[PDB]
Structure formats: structure tokens, C-alpha cells
Paper text:
The trimeric spike (S) glycoprotein decorates the surface of coronaviruses and mediates entry into host cells. FFA binding stabilizes a locked S conformation, interfering with virus infectivity. In the prefusion conformation, the RBDs in the S trimer can alternate between closed (“down”) and open (“up”) conformations.
We analyze SARS-CoV S by cryogenic electron microscopy (cryo-EM) showing that LA-bound SARS-CoV S adopts a hitherto elusive locked structure sharing characteristics with LA-bound locked SARS-CoV-2 S, incompatible with ACE2 receptor binding. The overlay of the RBDs from one chain in the open conformation with RBDs in the locked conformation illustrates rearrangements of Y352 and Y356 at the pocket entrance and a 5-Å movement of the gating helix to accommodate LA in the pocket. LA binding to S also induces a profound conformational change in the loop comprising residue R620, which then engages in a cation-π interaction with Y819. Residue Y819 is part of the fusion peptide proximal region of the neighboring S subunit.
Numbering used by the authors:
A (entry chain C): 751 to 866, 874 to 1044
B (entry chain A): 30 to 140, 150 to 167, 178 to 238, 246 to 604, 618 to 661, 672 to 750
C (entry chain A): 947 to 1044
D (entry chain B): 505 to 602
E (entry chain B): 260 to 308
F (entry chain B): 947 to 995
G (entry chain B): 407 to 455
């Protein structure tokens, strides 16, 4: 049930857009430079330049979800943690949506924002409309269009440098990765514990005790090892409910911050909200 | 010797309990579904009656007319040197006899020639005085009992075993107590008529049985037939919905045996220890080391017998399969009443001041009466024990002082008040009671499966098999896994290696001293994709950890290709995208279009928005839309009576719950 | 789950009590008590987590009743896809339909 | 587990039906209510069990009649109080009684 | 029977409750208190001896 | 909950150690360790919820 | 090992009593035998004559 919920969480956040939009080929709308938040045709990478930095900041336990039998046998010298989990029956399943597919959804969302049912409108007349929702008069933007665009381009740059250096902003995404790894490695370490039996090694017990005596000790080990699995499952259920609440709130901001102008105080930023852009991150999203 | 198939034959009632409208799962000796069965045909042209092995029980069926097949003979050597049991229907009644029979090479009835003579008899039973018949039987031999099951079905098949399902019922439980490894059929001759019979073998398996509303077994599922069958046994249902399911990891069974013991050639010195001319006194007990030898101790069966024998950290039936390290023997003499004190946790003069065992003792204790050698009619007084001391002894310590004793220190000279000698003599006599007769005691101690060993039981070694799943036995440690050479370096006093899980992942070969690594045989995740049993029975299987361009797959029917999720077998690959009926993973999905098809998932409808710095679009029309949204609000409210769920209506069980604490108050507060 | 042995000789309390005396029976009965108490505790823990999920859904249903049914909402996609006009609630088993 | 012909010395009694009693059928003891049953036991069968492994059927040794066994305790109960300080009286609600 | 005894500050038993007397007494023993608050409580299922 | 027996003869550690030797006490103390660990785990799980 | 073996999960009882008065004689009784040489061990409740 938990595994199925994880796919549902991602779908409700990124799959709001029904119709996919092709990436504009100009990336410069009315003095605003939208290059660095859209895919670069020259660069092979499908994700954007800002999305490149985020993926590098988060260390991931496993790249590919395939671990062949030969590889674990050929590298017995290294005490690989993943081979250890696999040999005790613990598995990790791949997500339904690939990292490229999520990047496609975010590319279309930015394209639709920057070009718009579609109802296309220039990026200038649109920002003038936003100023009306704030409370300012439209003539303010037209008279001061040039400096507003310059401030917008410098602000995009100030964000670029912060991600280039080491930032604590992605700490929450890092935390989720570490919690999952620790729980799996705790189960492997709990196989060494005696649960009132003479020994924790099943091969030792069966070698020196007969059937009737062996059952007494084996029963103790079974009782203790079942409790370890039950505790792990209960912890996972509580963690999942927390992730689900975070996923629900993220989908709300996508509808209200990215697909419209929000008049709620501090919901889509500290100041007076104009608009928002989403960007994909490992096991998360950045606004 | 034609080969046939047993589709679903060979199900029988497991026990004597009555069940109805239920599903029951059990592990027992069953004939697996669709297993090979040999055919034996008896006609005027050919008369088949060879000796077939038993092999942990058989399934026997006969398609014939005119009553050709009559019975069976079960035995080991099938001659007059061993017991055999005969079950025959001689046209008048059923006769069962188990005797030393002089078996005939050609046993048959005439339209009788079974045996010549019979002596050393044990059991006897007599009963009251286009094929069209199928008769089915099951035989098994457990704990000296030969079980017999029986069933009947009318048929019309010409010359082959009909397919179908039929449940057998018990008819006999024979207390024969004979060793059975072979059997033969008894067929009558007329030439011969048209008849045939078939034989199958039983293996341990887990079956799921379906009881109808009258208590009849109408269907069964073999959990080991295929991945779909295993899914049903785990879910405990005969129907499965559409979707993808996670089954057990990929399993492998061993195909070999490896035994590795060190080179020893000398028998252990049983005679010099048990049969030595002289043993010491209990207070001055002696200890001896046991050098590399073979511990058979079956040679003792001829000469030496023990009145006491008790092992503590090991079972008595495992001594012949182990290797022992740091073996020592202790010898001394006590009187009969004192033998009970040679055990951990005892008190008394012997345990307090003479000889004490540790609480966590590992070894065996032996003793035997020796009144004929250690006792004289005049009286023997060479054996002594200590009865005065300041404090108690520590385990495996001795005191051989002879300093005079005075209570509360204050040394003394022997001829003085409150001055005593601390030792006493036993004084064994020929005519005294057994409680005062002498006994010789030997105590053996050792460790197991932790360090190099030089003493081992009688067993035969084998060659090493590497890069293959096998059963292994290294100096008494057994298991299943794969052996490969290792780069680890062991110090001379190290014999085994262990990991953080405490699994034994390394061992030094005793004969060649080569370090080896040990790894499990089962590895890799599996999952089953089905469109629903009601729709079809075919399924596709996804292997997450296989690269199919030595494949670790159960079977390759067809449609094998590599996806981003793994190696998929049993689905057609199409190039068009669809709405992801069933999510496989990594952007792959499956559907039932009639075969299972796998395709890449589509993200949505595609379009392009033209951008213009001078244009704008404004709607001129509108429509009214109504949509529905559904939300849960509340769930069911429940309560629990813990004294009824636990202990039912039992009173004494309820009393035990009260003494157990019974934290039921907090359970109900949470639910309330 | 009442049919499972928890290391004892049998899962039937009437079978143990019939052929084992008080001392021998007490050994087996304690094993069954421990396992059956553990079964109850697992059921209660799952119910608490399930109730937490329902409570969150109930709170959101109360928010939409106030904002979508008793007034006009400007939040995008909160009270339907298009531009919201009004809403009507209808009762359902263990839920509500808007 | 099955039919038995060797028994200890004990005096039998008459069957009592539709009433909670202490029973002992061929050495198996317990408490419950005995009523006639329609289940059809095969000759080699003596006892019957349900999914919970509770013993719920038995063939009478003397008359070979099939009898159903059910517990004696059943039904929900709750207590209403106004507070012991205010009053010592209470009311009782029986959920499963008409 | 099962009884709930009350020990005072000097070690003297001054009161008691018999859990088998009536439904209210059984409620007291389960919660282990001589005082009960207003409300409705769930008790053991109807018993027949 | 520290006063509850968990299948052991006594719930008081000092009582068991006073009259039983090392091996026979190791059986009873294990029963108390498992039970008291279960109490702690239940408390932690409730705190998380 | 060679004459009479009980199964691991044995249900029953074992009885023995001394019969030296009837089974023993001054000269010596040699009518009772037992096997001490065999290839392998016996299975439960199986005999070899
Ligand atoms: C080892 O020898 C010492 C030397 O005598 C023992 O110590 C004495 O123990 C007795 C008995 O408790 C006391 O009454 C003496 O006062 C001790 N003497 C000294 C000098 O300490 C010691 O008990 C012996 N160890 C054992 C296990 O018996
Ligand atoms: C049942 O009888 C068979 C045949 O007499 C026994 O098989 C023999 O076992 C010995 C000891 O291992 C071998 O040396 C022989 O070669 C075996 N005979 C054959 C024909 O293979 C079998 O051991 C007996 N079973 C029991 C439990 O005693
Ligand atoms: C000097 C040889 C001492 C024996 C070697 C030491 C350990 C051998 C391994 C296990 C103990 C074997 C018990 C031998 C007595 C058999 C008793 C019997 O006949 O039933
Ligand atoms: C937009 O930004 C990119 C990256 O900083 C820069 O290379 C490009 O020149 C900018 N646009 C224009 C029109 O200069
Ligand atoms: C078995 O038969 C042969 C052949 O007559 C005979 O020599 C032998 O003594 C018989 N064995 C026994 C045990 O009677
Ligand atoms: C069958 O065997 C029984 C018992 O040995 C015997 O009495 C009877 O005469 C036999 N019948 C035939 C036809 O051989
Ligand atoms: C077996 O038969 C022989 C004679 O052939 C006899 O001497 C011996 O006592 C018999 N043994 C048994 C156990 O009946
Ligand atoms: C059970 O038995 C009754 C009575 O003979 C019969 O009518 C019914 O068909 C049987 N049930 C099944 C499933 O055969
Ligand atoms: C058994 O002991 C007897 C008597 O000493 C002897 O004759 C016989 O040869 C021994 N057997 C073996 C196998 O050693
Ligand atoms: C045991 O024998 C093998 C071959 O017979 C030999 O290679 C090995 O060295 C021997 N063991 C020792 C310790 O010498
Ligand atoms: C599988 O093997 C092929 C050919 O060797 C290789 O191209 C491919 O990358 C492999 N896949 C994985 C997941 O290792
Ligand atoms: C919208 O289009 C429909 C289609 O015929 C038309 O009947 C209706 O009058 C239009 N609405 C307006 C406001 O023109
Ligand atoms: C036992 O005795 C009663 C009355 O004496 C009789 O009715 C019953 O049939 C007998 N049992 C059997 C199995 O016949
Ligand atoms: C306890 O004993 C003291 C000593 O006389 C007394 O004063 C007090 O009243 C006693 N407590 C009660 C509750 O009576």
C-alpha cells in the first residue's frame, strides 16, 4: 500500500497539466531572460541548467535498481551494503515515473506560464495584469519596464550562485534519503542478536542439537525476528503519512502559486506574490 | 517403459478431522501435479513384472478389465534373508501376510505361484469371504506403519491414464516394522489379458485443499507448480485480480555434497583411558589430553558398558558428525551414592571440596561400577576424599594439601583439641551394599565449531566443488551455499570468519589450508503480472536483477526482452503508447489486448503555443459544467473484550491472564 | 490468527487442558497468551494510523463546506476546475459528495 | 484426534441439550451449548473443527449422533452513569437483546 | 472472587470493592478507581455460567 | 507495568537472584527483559502517533 | 542404535521391572541375545531379525 501511494503522490503534483507544450525556441520575452529554467537544445541534457545543480547537491544511495548475482560475488572483498540487504531479502523497487519524464512535465509548465484553453498573451501585458492584482497601477510597469526586467535577471542569477556553492536548502531532501537507508541497515544488524537462545546462528544450532532440542531454540529466534520486521513496517507507515501531508501541500501550491496569483499572506513568498516557477528535484520539488 | 503425466491425481485426506466450506493448507508427501509416471503393460505379447524402487512412497494406479492386477509384495532384498509383506486378493478375500518368503522370480495367479515356503512369521490378517475400471492407491511407510489409501473411478480410456481429480480415503494402517525399499506387482495369467498399471513417486510439498459444504475435497492447488500457483497459496484464494504482485525471491536448490575433514588415521585411546590398571583418588584427580584420533566408540559396544551417560552442550545423536577441539579427560573414583554429585549446580562433600563442574559446562559424564577389581574381601582403603576445608573450590581446581585442620584458622598440631586430619578413607568391601560400592568416573570436556580441531568422528570426505550451490560440512559445520576462493588472510589460530550479521562467510579448508568464501544461493526479486484468473491463466514474469541481453530465470517460454525495469518474459512489445493500464515501473506498463503487451507510457496530448508580441485571444462563448468530488468522513467504531478473545470461556486460563498483567485497559482506552 | 501456534504444542486451549496438569499446562498457556496479546496490539496500532488519515480527510471536507458551499471561493482548483460559482452537498455512506 | 475404544474408568450421564454445561466427550472437556447438527461425518471421523481451530462438532459415542458445540457468552453490554459523586445508580444497555 | 483492596496511609485496609457484585463494581475494578466520571462505558460481554 | 509477571515466577529481580543460581535465573530474567522491552516500544509508538 | 529405537515425537509411556528371580539361574541363562554389529542405524519402530 505504501509503494502504490508514492506513485500517487508524484502524479498529483506534476501531472496537473493535461496538454503538453513544446519548449519555445527564443527564451527571451520582453526583456526577461527565461534561459537557465528551460531545456537547452544545444546541450544534450533534457533538464534545465538550474535543475542540473539541484540533482548534484543530493547524494543518492543507488543509481540503478539492478544488481546482478555475478557482481556481488565478484566483489566479495568490499563490504557492500546493498549486496548485504539483498542477501537477506530486502528489496527496493524503482519509481513508476522516470527522472526524465518529471523534467518533461516541469518544462511544459514553465512554457505554458511564459506563453499564456491556451489564450496566448505577450510577457509584458501579462506582468501588467499581475500588477493590478497587487494593487499597483499598470502604468507603473510600462514606464519602468527596463529596470524591472534587469532586477528580474539579476535575481535569477543570485539564485544560480547559491546552488553552485554548498547550501542547506536541500537538507530536507537529503534527510529523506538518509532515513530510508538507516532503517534498512538497522534490520541487517539485528540478525546478530540473541533473543534468549543459545546462539544467533541457525547453522550452528542445527549442527550440534537434535530435532527436539533445536525447535526450542529456533522458536525463540523466530519470535524475535518477526518483531524486528513488524517494528520496521510500523515506522514506515508513520513516515509515509508525514510524506503524504507534504505532498498534498505541494500540490496546493502548484495550483495556487504557479497556475494563478494568490492573495493569501505568505503562501507563495514573503512579499506580494506575482508568480512562481516549479523545478524538479530528487524525491521533491523546488518553487 | 513409456512416460505419461499425472495431471492432478494423488490427493488424499490428510487427517481424521472434519472440515467444511473452508480452505486448508498442509505440508506432507504428495504427488506433484503434472509429474512423470511410467507405464507397465501386461498382455499375451509382453508380461511386465520387474522390481521397482520405493523411494519414500509411491502412487499406484491400474487401468484394466477382467481383474488382472491382484496385489503387491514389499521388501528389501526380495529373498528369504529378509522380511517381506504380501497383500493379495485371491478371488475369495484379501489376505495380508508378512513373513520370510522364498520369493519366486515369476509371481502370478493361474486362471497359485507366489512363494515356496514361509517361516519366522510376524503379522497376519484375513478378510471376510477399452478399459472400464480405474483403481488408485497410495503407499507410505512412516514410523513402522504402512499406510494404504484407496479410490475408484469408472473410465472408458483405451490405453492411457485419464486426466482429472479424485480424492483417496484411508483403508489400512499396518504395524509391520519392516525395512521397505523395493516392491513388485502380482499379475495373473490366462498368455495374458489386456491390462496396465502406472507408478509415480511422492515428494514433500505444500498443498492447499478446498473442502466443499459436505466435507468433500473437490479441488487443490500445488504451491510449487509455477509462480501463479505460489501467489495463490500466499493469498490463500483460488482467484486473483488484475495487476502486478511481488512474489518470493529467486530460489535455487543444491546439486551436490561436500564433506571436508582433516587427515586422521589413528583410533582414539579408549582402552588406555577406560581400561587403565590404576585410577587416582577423587581429591587428587588427574587430567589427560587427547591427541588427534578418530572417536568411533562403537567398538565399546562389544566390551564396555556404562551405568551413567549424560551430555550437556550437545545432543547424543550428533556425536558421530562433529569435530572436537581442546579435548581433555579427568579420572577418579567415588562411591555409588556420590555419582549424582558429578553434575553442574550440585552440592555436597564431593562438589564442595573435591571436584566441581562449571555452570556452563560442555561435555559428557561417564561412570560404571567396578566392584570386582576395586574391592577386596578384606577391605580396600587406598581411596580418599576431603571433608574439611575453609571455603569451597572453584571449577576445575584441585587441592592436594594434607595440613591439619582446626575450625576458624588457628593452626594446630595433630594431637590436640579441635585438630583433625582433613582426609577420610572409603573402605570398599565385597559384601557391602551397592550404595557404598566403588565407581570409576570419566569426564570429557571440549569446545565446538569455534577453533581448529584434531579429533573427529568417523566420516568420509569428498572433493571440493566450487562455483555451484551445494550442501557442505566443514569440520562439523553444515549449510548450503556457493564456494569460491578468497583473498582474506587467516592467522594460524583462526579457522572461521564471520560478518556483522554473524553469518559464517569464510572457512579454511582442513586438508589444503585454502581460504574459501561462502555465499547464499537465493538472490533476486521477482513479480507476477496477470490479467485476472477469470480472464486467463497465462501470466508474465518480471526479473529485476537479470540482464537477458547463464540466465537466472525459472523458464523461458517466449517473448523475452530487456526493459528498464528488468527482464520480462511472456509479453509482446508494441511501439505505440497508451494509458498505462498496469504500472510495471521505470516508464513501462502492461495491458491485455489476446495476449499481454508491454509498452512505454504516454505523458499526454501534445501541442504548440504560438507566441506573438502583438496578438491576444479572447473567448466569445461559455458553458456551464458540473463535477463531483467524493471524500471519506468517518470509519467504523469497534470494541474488544480481551478476556473473550484470549482464554474464551476457560476459567484457569482467565486466572493466568490476571497474573500476566493483562494490559487490556490501555488497549480499550485507545479504541474508545 | 487464533489458529496459529506460538511455540506451544497446540492452538486449542481445551486440548492442552485435557491431557496436561497444572504445571505443564501453565507453560504452554503462557505462550499462547503472549502471542494473542501481540495480535491485539498490532490491530490497535493499525487502527490509530488509519484514523489519522480519515481525520485529515474530514478536516478538508469541513473546509470545503464553509468555503465552497456557503460562499464563493477564489482559490484556484479548490472547488472544481473552472471558475467556481456554487456547490451542493449530498450525503453518502461514510462520506459526502460535492 | 480419532475414534477410541480404550477408555479410563468413568461414569457416563444423559445428554443435556439447549443449556450451558460442562461436557467431556471421549476425554475432551469444555463448556458450551449442545444442539443437534446436520453435518455428515464419514466413518473414520470423530471431531470437527472450524477455521479458528475451535472444536465445534462431535459424534456421540453411544448413539453416534452429530452434535454442534457453541460457547455460552455472547452479546455487548455498556453502562451509563451520572457520576458516583452525584448518584450511585446506573443504567445498562444491551445491544443484542430485543 | 476478585477483590480490590484500599490501603490507607498507616497501612490499614479501610475499604474494598467486589468486582462481581454488579456492573458498576466491575467498571471500578477494570479502571482501578473508586471514583467514576459521568459518561457511558463499555464493559465485558454478557456472561453465562 | 513493572509489577507484571511476563511468564516468570516473580517480577522482582532481587527475589529471583536471591534463591536461584546463574543458569536457572537466566531463564527467568530473559522473560522479564522481553516483556519490559515490549512496554518501552509501545510507549514510543504512541508518542510518534 | 541397532535393536530398538523410539521416534523423536513419541507419545506413550515406558515401564520396566526387575525379574531376576524368573529370568536368571545359578548355572547361567543364555537364551537372550542382542545385535552389536550392523551397517547403519535403525529407523524408529523397525526391527531386524
Ligand atoms: C587460594 O589460597 C588462598 C591462601 O590461603 C586462600 O585464601 C584463604 O581463604 C580462606 C577461606 O576463605 C580464608 O579463611 C583465609 O584467610 C585466606 N587466606 C588469605 C591469605 O587470604 C583462598 O581461599 C584460596 N582460593 C580458593 C578458591 O580456595
Ligand atoms: C534397508 O535395507 C537395505 C538393503 O538391505 C539397506 O541398504 C543397504 O545399506 C548398507 C549400509 O549403508 C549398504 O552398505 C548397502 O549397500 C545397502 N544395500 C543396497 C542394496 O543398496 C538399508 O540400509 C536398510 N535400511 C535400514 C534403515 O536399515
Ligand atoms: C580417550 C578417548 C576419549 C573419547 C574422545 C573424546 C571425545 C569423543 C566425542 C564424544 C564423546 C564420545 C562418548 C564415548 C562414550 C560412548 C558411551 C556409549 O558407549 O554409549
Ligand atoms: C540569457 O542568459 C544567458 C545565461 O546567463 C546568457 O548567455 C544570454 O546571453 C542571456 N540573454 C541575452 C539576450 O544575452
Ligand atoms: C534360503 O533359501 C536357501 C535355498 O534353499 C537356503 O539354503 C537358505 O538356508 C535359506 N535361508 C534361511 C534363512 O532359511
Ligand atoms: C484365499 O485365501 C484364504 C486364506 O488363506 C483361503 O481360506 C481361501 O481358500 C483362498 N481362496 C482361494 C480361491 O485360493
Ligand atoms: C529363524 O529361523 C531359524 C531357522 O530357519 C531359527 O533357528 C531362528 O530361531 C528363527 N528366528 C526367529 C527370530 O524366528
Ligand atoms: C451435498 O449433499 C447433498 C445431499 O446429498 C447434495 O444434494 C448436494 O449436491 C451436495 N453438495 C455438493 C457440492 O455436491
Ligand atoms: C567381541 O568380543 C568377543 C569376546 O572377546 C570376541 O571374541 C570378538 O572377536 C569381538 N568382536 C569384534 C568385532 O571385535
Ligand atoms: C591431507 O591429505 C592431502 C592429500 O591426501 C594432502 O594434500 C594434505 O596435505 C594432507 N593434510 C596435511 C595436513 O598434510
Ligand atoms: C545488459 O547487457 C548489455 C550488453 O552487454 C548492456 O549493453 C547493458 O547495458 C546491460 N544492462 C545493464 C542494466 O547492465
Ligand atoms: C455560445 O454558443 C452557443 C452555440 O450555439 C450559442 O447558442 C450561444 O448564444 C453563445 N453564447 C453567447 C453569449 O453568444
Ligand atoms: C451403547 O449402549 C446403549 C444402551 O445400552 C445403546 O443404545 C448403544 O447402541 C450402545 N452403543 C452402540 C455403539 O451400539
Ligand atoms: C494514622 O495514625 C495516626 C497516629 O495516631 C493517626 O493520627 C491518623 O489519624 C491515622 N490515619 C488515619 C487515616 O486514621
Amino acid at each position: 500500500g505504501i509503494a502504490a501511494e508514492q506513485d500517487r503522490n508524484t502524479r498529483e503534483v506534476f501531472a496537473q497539466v493535461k496538454q503538453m507544450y513544446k519548449t519555445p525556441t527564443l527564451k527571451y520575452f520582453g526583456g526577461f531572460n527565461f534561459s537557465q529554467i528551460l531545456p537547452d537544445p544545444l546541450k544534450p541534457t533534457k533538464r534545465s541548467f538550474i535543475e542540473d545543480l539541484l540533482f548534484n547537491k543530493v547524494t543518492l544511495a543507488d543509481a540503478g535498481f539492478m544488481k546482478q548475482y555475478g557482481e556481488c560475488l565478484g566483489d566479495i572483498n568490499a563490504r557492500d551494503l546493498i549486496c548485504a540487504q539483498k542477501f537477506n531479502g530486502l528489496t527496493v523497487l524503482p519509481p513508476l515515473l522516470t527522472d526524465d519524464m518529471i523534467a518533461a512535465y516541469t518544462a511544459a509548465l514553465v512554457s505554458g506560464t511564459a506563453t499564456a484553453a491556451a489564450l496566448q498573451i505577450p510577457f509584458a501585458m501579462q506582468m501588467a495584469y499581475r500588477f493590478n492584482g497587487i494593487g499597483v497601477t499598470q502604468n507603473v510597469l510600462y514606464e519602468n519596464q527596463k529596470q524591472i526586467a534587469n532586477q528580474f535577471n539579476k535575481a535569477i542569477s543570485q539564485i544560480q550562485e547559491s546552488l553552485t556553492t554548498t547550501s542547506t536548502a536541500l537538507g530536507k531532501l537529503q534527510d529523506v534519503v538518509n532515513q530510508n537507508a538507516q532503517a534498512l541497515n538497522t534490520l541487517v544488524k539485528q540478525l546478530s542478536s540473541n533473543f534468549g537462545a543459545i546462539s544467533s546462528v541457525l547453522n550452528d544450532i542445527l549442527s550440534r542439537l537434535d530435532k527436539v532440542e533445536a525447535e526450542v531454540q529456533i522458536d525463540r529466534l523466530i519470535t524475535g525476528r518477526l518483531q524486528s520486521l513488524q517494528t520496521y513496517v510500523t515506522q514506515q507507515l508513520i513516515r509515509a503519512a508525514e510524506i503524504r501531508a507534504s505532498a498534498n501541500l505541494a500540490a496546493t501550491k502548484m495550483s495556487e502559486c504557479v497556475l494563478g496569483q494568490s492573495k493569501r499572506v505568505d503562501f507563495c513568498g514573503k512579499g506580494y506574490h506575482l508568480m512562481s516557477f516549479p523545478q524538479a528535484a530528487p524525491h521533491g520539488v523546488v518553487f | 517403459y513409456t512416460q505419461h503425466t499425472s495431471s492432478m491425481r494423488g490427493v488424499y485426506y490428510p487427517d481424521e478431522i472434519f472440515r467444511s466450506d473452508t480452505l486448508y493448507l498442509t505440508q506432507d508427501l504428495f504427488l506433484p501435479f503434472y509429474s512423470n509416471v511410467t507405464g507397465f503393460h501386461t498382455i499375451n505379447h509382453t508380461f511386465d513384472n520387474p522390481v521397482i524402487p520405493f523411494k519414500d512412497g509411491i502412487y499406484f494406479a491400474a487401468t484394466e478389465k477382467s481383474n488382472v492386477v491382484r496385489g503387491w509384495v514389499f521388501g528389501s532384498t526380495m529373498n528369504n534373508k529378509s522380511q517381506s509383506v504380501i497383500i493379495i486378493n485371491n478371488s475369495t478375500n484379501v489376505v495380508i501376510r508378512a513373513c520370510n518368503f522364498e520369493l519366486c522370480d515369476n509371481p502370478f495367479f493361474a486362471v497359485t505361484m507366489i512363494f515356496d515356503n514361509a517361516f519366522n512369521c510376524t503379522f497376519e490378517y484375513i478378510s471376510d469371504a477399452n478399459f472400464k475400471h480405474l483403481r488408485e492407491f497410495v503407499f507410505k511407510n512412516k514410523d513402522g506403519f504402512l499406510y494404504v489409501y484407496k479410490g475408484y473411478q469408472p473410465i472408458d480410456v483405451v490405453r492411457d491414464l485419464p486426466s482429472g481429480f479424485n480424492t483417496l480415503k484411508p483403508i489400512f494402517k499396518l504395524p509391520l516394522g519392516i525395512n521397505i525399499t523395493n516392491f513388485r506387482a502380482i499379475l495373473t495369467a490366462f498368455g495374458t489379458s489386456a491390462a496396465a498399471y502406472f507408478v509415480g513417486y511422492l515428494k514433500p510439498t505444500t498443498f492447499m485443499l478446498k473442502y466443499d459444504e459436505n466435507g468433500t475435497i473437490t479441488d487443490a492447488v500445488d504451491c510449487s507448480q509455477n509462480p501463479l500457483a505460489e501467489l495463490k497459496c500466499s493469498v490463500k484464494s483460488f482467484e486473483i485480480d488484475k495487476g502486478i504482485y511481488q512474489t518470493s525471491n529467486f530460489r535455487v536448490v543444491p546439486s551436490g555434497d561436500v564433506v571436508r575433514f582433516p587427515n586422521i588415521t589413528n583410533l582414539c585411546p579408549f582402552g588406555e583411558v577406560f581400561n587403565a590398571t590404576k585410577f587416582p583418588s577423587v581429591y587428587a584427580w588427574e587430567r589427560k589430553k587427547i591427541s588427534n584420533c578418530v572417536a568411533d566408540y562403537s567398538v565399546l559396544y562389544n566390551s564396555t558398558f556404562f551405568s551413567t551417560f549424560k551430555c550437556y552442550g550437545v545432543s547424543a545423536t550428533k556425536l558421530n558428525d562433529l569435530c572436537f577441539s581442546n579435548v581433555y579427560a579427568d579420572s577418579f573414583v567415588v562411591k555409588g551414592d556420590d555419582v549424582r554429585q558429578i553434575a553442574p549446580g550440585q552440592t555436597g562433600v564431593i562438589a564442595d571440596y573435591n571436584y566441581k563442574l562449571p555452570d556452563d559446562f560442555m561435555g559428557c559424564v561417564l561412570a560404571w561400577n567396578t566392584r570386582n577389581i576395586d574391592a577386596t574381601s578384606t577391605g580396600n582403603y587406598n581411596y580418599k576424599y576431603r571433608y574439611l576445608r575453609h571455603g569451597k573450590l572453584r571449577p576445575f581446581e584441585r587441592d592436594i594439601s594434607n595440613v591439619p585442620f582446626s575450625p576458624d584458622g588457628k593452626p594446630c598440631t595433630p594431637p590436640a583439641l579441635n585438630c583433625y586430619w582433613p582426609l577420610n578413607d572409603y573402605g570398599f568391601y565385597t559384601t557391602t551394599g551397592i550404595g557404598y560400592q566403588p565407581y570409576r568416573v570419566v569426564v570429557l570436556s571440549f569446545e565446538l565449531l569455534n577453533a581448529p580441531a584434531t579429533v573427529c568422528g568417523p566420516k568420509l570426505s569428498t572433493d571440493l566443488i566450487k562455483n555451484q550451490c551445494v550442501n557442505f560440512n566443514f569440520n562439523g559445520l553444515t549449510g548450503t551455499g556457493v564456494l569460491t576462493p578468497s583473498s582474506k588472510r587467516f592467522q594460524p589460530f583462526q579457522q572461521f570468519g564471520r560478518d556483522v550479521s554473524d553469518f559464517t562467510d569464510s572457512v579454511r579448508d582442513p586438508k589444503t589450508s585454502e581460504i574459501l568464501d561462502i555465499s547464499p544461493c537465493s538472490f533476486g526479486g521477482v513479480s507476477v503480472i496477470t490479467p485476472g484468473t477469470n480472464a486467463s491463466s497465462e501470466v508474465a514474469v518480471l526479473y529485476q536483477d537479470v540482464n537477458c541481453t547463464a540466465w537466472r530465470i525459472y523458464s523461458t517460454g517466449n517473448n523475452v526482452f530487456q526493459t528498464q525495469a528488468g527482464c520480462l518474459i511472456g509479453a509482446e512489445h508494441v511501439d505505440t503508447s497508451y494509458e498505462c493500464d498496469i504500472p510495471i515501473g521505470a516508464g513501462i506498463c502492461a495491458s491485455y489486448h489476446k495476449s499481454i503487451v508491454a509498452y512505454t507510457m504516454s505523458l499526454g496530448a501534445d501541442s504548440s503555443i504560438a507566441y506573438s508580441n502583438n496578438t491576444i485571444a479572447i473567448p466569445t462563448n461559455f458553458s456551464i459544467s458540473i463535477t463531483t468530488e467524493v471524500m471519506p468522513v468517518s470509519m467504523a467504531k469497534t470494541s474488544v473484550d480481551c478476556n473473550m478473545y484470549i482464554c474464551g470461556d476457560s476459567t484457569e486460563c482467565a486466572n493466568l491472564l490476571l497474573q500476566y498483567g493483562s494490559f487490556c485497559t490501555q488497549l480499550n482506552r485507545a479504541l474508545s
